[PDB]
Amino acid sequence: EARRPKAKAVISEIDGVVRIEETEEKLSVFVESEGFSKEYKLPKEARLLVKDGDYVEAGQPLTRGAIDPHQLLEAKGPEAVERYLVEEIQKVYRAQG
Structure with missing residues (x-):
């Protein structure tokens, strides 16, 4: 159905x-670009997937979880989400053999 999940990861x-910034009542991450950039707020115990200073592609999960296939589609393009969708279905079926 292409629903945006509840446990939605932020790409x-x-x-x-x-560059991480982990203060007491906020834990914000900046993905800085050679021009300008945006800031991604999220609850503190959220589980990262970016070692500070690493290099990210557009649409590459920063937090973990499921990916809104729409945020993906707009970010990385159809074969990119065409990819996610096929593999993600399969992981369920594999799991049951």
């Missing part, structure tokens, strides 16, 4: 490189 809108 990156553009190319860039990250």
Whole structure:
């Protein structure tokens, strides 16, 4: 159905490189680009997938979880989401043999 999940992971809108900022009542991540960049707020115990300073593709999950296939489609293009969709279905079926 292409629903945007509840446990939605937050992907990156553009190319860039990250820098964590873990203060008490906020844990924000910046994916900075050679021009300008955006800031991604999220609850603190959220589980990262970016070692600070690493290099991210546009649409590459920063948090973990499921990916809104729409946020993906707009970010990385059809074969990109065509990819996610096929593999993600399969992981369920494999799991049951």
